[PDB]
Design a protein around this nucleic acid. Sequence first.
DNA 1: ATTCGCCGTGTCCCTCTCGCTCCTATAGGTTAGACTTTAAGTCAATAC
RNA 2: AGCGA
DNA 3: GTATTGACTTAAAGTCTAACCTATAGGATACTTACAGAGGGACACGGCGAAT
Lengths: 99, 49, 301
Amino acid sequence: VLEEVIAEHPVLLNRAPTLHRLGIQAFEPMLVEGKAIQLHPLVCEAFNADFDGDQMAVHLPLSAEAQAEARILMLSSNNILSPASGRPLAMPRLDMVTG
Amino acid sequence: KLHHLVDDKIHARSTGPYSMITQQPLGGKAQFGGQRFGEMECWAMQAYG
Amino acid sequence: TASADSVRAYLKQIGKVALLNAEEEVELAKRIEAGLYATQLMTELSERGEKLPAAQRRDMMWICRDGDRAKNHLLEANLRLVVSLAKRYTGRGMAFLDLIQEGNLGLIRAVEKFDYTKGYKFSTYATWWIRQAITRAMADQARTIRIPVHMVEVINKLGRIQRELLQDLGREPTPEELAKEMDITPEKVLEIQQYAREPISLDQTISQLGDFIEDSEAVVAVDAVSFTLLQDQLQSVLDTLSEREAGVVRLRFGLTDGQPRTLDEIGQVYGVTRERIRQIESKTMSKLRHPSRSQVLRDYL
DNA sequence: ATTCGCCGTGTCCCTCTCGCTCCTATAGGTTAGACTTTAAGTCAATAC
RNA sequence: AGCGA
DNA sequence: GTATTGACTTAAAGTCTAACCTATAGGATACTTACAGAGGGACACGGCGAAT
Ligand SMILES: [Mg+2]
């Protein structure tokens, strides 16, 4: 039953210190074995998050308006470029660049 | 193996204890509490609109 | 200078008037007593009395105002006694000034109730009155919670006994030890320890304790909706049964207004006898104990 | 000596986020405690 | 009061 | 099944006495001045000098 409730209901992923606008982004959650949040590697640039043991906060929008706001404005795929210079922050980096 | 194990960190709250003078949710994994949605996070949200 | 010290300002203030002696004190006491009797006689003569002769009214009013003068003069004289006495107690009480003012109140009581014919210096009687007033006010205004005087005294005696036994023996004694020392019961000793407790401050440094104070008495946030659905289910179940039975149960257990109606009242409002309704109640409750009417309610405990 | 223009010194509000582990005497109010009364709840039998 | 990023 | 009467016990008051806290007043030798025991920017309250 948990799968059915989870389907199509985004969540917010805060990381302190939230330096800039992309510190909070809305993702579609999916259930994962274990006890560690699995984060997509390509928002690491936006979050300034290396995996040396950093922690993130999952929030949960409730009202229909909040769900729409997360779905449309704060979705990952809708926030690629910087707010500063418009360069892509979903740009492949590090290991993928090497590949 | 370092002493930063997931079981000692994972935390969640749907509805738990509450503060006394202010009616905010409590804080700390010792309690349930919630995550401080702080001022910079507020700024991020406003910037999004 | 930064002369914002009301303490030193008050000391400088009270240093103006000169200290007095025994014969002067007798003179002031005579003047105040005569002034009081003068005011009393003038009131008596003002009500259905006598038209006070102008000269007599004049000099007796002088006597009155002069008695008040002498009273004030004496209080100014013994303010220094008040401060000198108050010094010993400070360390365990409130602002020094409060104790000084309680001492002054004791002084006005003393000068009201002094007798000079016994031929004594006023200092001793003043001292005792002052100390009584200071201790009383300190006790009444000591803690945020009020602890009356006799229990205050037994608390102080327990504390003194425990402190002297700590000095002598070196160890903190036991509740039975203090019970036998004070000729009281160990449970009484425990109660005195309990009431001796002083409130902690919500404000502290650690941060303030007020941060981590769970509201154990508060919204459960689940039992609210649980009780809402409970009530819905009970209305449903009661509708499942006969209307008369449902109304009887509702009045018996106060489900309609919160007022629990009893057998005589319900028999009156239904125009039948209380034993009739008791039969109704027993049969209906037996019906309700049948699991089909209770499977939907069993989980609500 | 006052005016106006400079200096000079003294007193005060503010500085990243997120998590975890002393005595006496009177008089009055309160409650408490037990005895007594009464509406109340029950049980047994019963007639329709 | 101590600690992690 | 539904509505009754006559014991038979029971909880809820009602009351009487009471007993035990609790608030208040007084204490009559002499008794006479608390204590002390960062830094930075900025503005406002005030040194030093030319002019009338
Ligand atoms: Mg890191």
